[PDB]
Design a protein around this ligand. Structure first.
Ligand code: QGB
Ligand code: NA
Length: 365
């Protein structure tokens, strides 16, 4: 089984005990570490933070303590120039520029592969034709990585992609059966299913639907997303189930209505460390005093509320349930966003180091 864990190069700016650098990573925790995020300059892979060259060398240096570990660099994310992927995939020449730059850049810094995090071909400004051009990009990368291994004599570079759970993004952007052949594994982003863009509370990452949900709402859950990716042709062994070490928060319209589906007036108050309305790290929720925690019976995940604040998040028990689920489906392992949002140094939750991600490591064993 794989345990694919994401590092973020902006967690180094979090205050106090929440600051996260490569020295905070446990080299033995995961099987694959993915560095988020690289950028793109004139169709070439490029750094995004002043110290990326130094952090890359500390990150890949962790393979000295765990030689089984593989590392990848993720390109893209949710803050990204709106035309960069589209212009790069638009021509064979620009795809060649990108592929050749990726090989040189990954080898220079000792990464073992590339993770594609385009949000998203065919949606959010990206034209309909990018669905097919994304397939060509994936083919071009796979072909060039195969050839480079033979010329260089190194291990062939790995290729993965982070893919959406939402049905309309999947249909608009991905020739699932074609790309799954050329990708070594597929990181399913099984989270962000509900959020403060909605006028009622809902869980970030529920496993199943609620009885009351039907139509399109009945597909806003992990099981529906996994079934769509499998039914469209992803081999089960290549599908890696994403897990969130964060939750999504709401301000309730009234403190007396706290149910799932209760009216909400906007995002929950920003957390003290992550400072972003609507989201909270696990270490910001796990500790709340004077709160009430409940489980959503049909969806197998918890929420917690206090006064007019309501947060859907994942705990040790829901991570255990989701690993049981992925094993029942024969999936290739679990993926986690993100290392720096778990209680990575045992400073908040009274559950030791990495309580959520260590649960995955043990249950996948
Ligand atoms: C706009 C969304 C974006 N969303 C990302 C989740 C990981 N996603 C992904 N996973 C892989 N494998 N690649 N990219 C990409 C989307 C969350 C990012 C987040 C922000 C703050 C805090 Cl505290 C927790 C989380 C919530 O806000
Ligand atoms: Na989605």
């Amino acid at each position: 089984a794989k345990l694919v864990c994401y590092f973020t190069n902006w967690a180094q700016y979090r205050q106090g005990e929440a600051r996260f650098l490569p020295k905070d990573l446990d080299p033995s925790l995961c099987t694959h570490l993915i560095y988020a995020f690289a950028g793109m300059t004139n169709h070439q892979l490029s750094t995004t933070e002043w110290n990326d060259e130094t952090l890359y060398q500390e990150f890949n240096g962790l393979k000295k303590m765990n030689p089984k570990l593989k590392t990848l660099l993720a390109i893209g994310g949710w803050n990204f120039g709106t035309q960069k992927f589209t212009d790069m995939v638009a021509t064979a020449n620009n795809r060649q520029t990108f592929v050749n730059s990726a090989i040189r850049f990954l080898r220079k810094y000792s990464f073992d592969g590339l993770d594609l995090d385009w949000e998203y071909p065919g949606s959010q400004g990206s034209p309909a034709v990018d669905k097919e051009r994304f397939t060509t990009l994936v083919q071009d990368l796979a072909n060039a990585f195969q050839q480079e291994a033979q010329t260089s004599g190194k291990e062939r570079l790995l290729l993965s992609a982070a893919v959406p759970a939402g049905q309309t993004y999947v249909d608009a952007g991905y020739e699932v059966d074609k790309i799954a052949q050329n990708l070594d594994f597929v990181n399913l982003m099984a989270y962000d299913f509900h959020g403060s863009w909605e006028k009622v509370t809902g869980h970030n990452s529920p496993l199943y639907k609620r009885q009351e949900e039907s139509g399109a709402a009945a597909s806003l859950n992990v099981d529906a997303a996994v079934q769509q990716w499998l039914q469209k042709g992803t081999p089960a062994s290549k599908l890696i189930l994403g897990m969130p070490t964060y939750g999504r928060s709401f301000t309730l319209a009234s403190s007396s209505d706290t149910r799932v589906g209760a009216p909400a007036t906007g995002s929950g108050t920003p957390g003290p460390f992550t400072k972003e309305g609507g989201m909270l790290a696990y270490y910001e929720v796990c500790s709340w005093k004077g709160a009430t925690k409940q489980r959503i019976q049909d969806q197998k995940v918890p929420y917690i509320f206090r006064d007019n604040q309501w947060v859907g998040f994942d705990d040790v028990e829901s991570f255990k349930t989701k690993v049981s689920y992925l094993k029942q489906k024969g999936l290739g392992g679990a993926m986690v966003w993100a290392l720096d949002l778990d209680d990575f140094a045992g400073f908040s939750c009274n559950q030791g180091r990495y309580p959520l991600i260590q649960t995955l490591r043990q249950e996948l064993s």
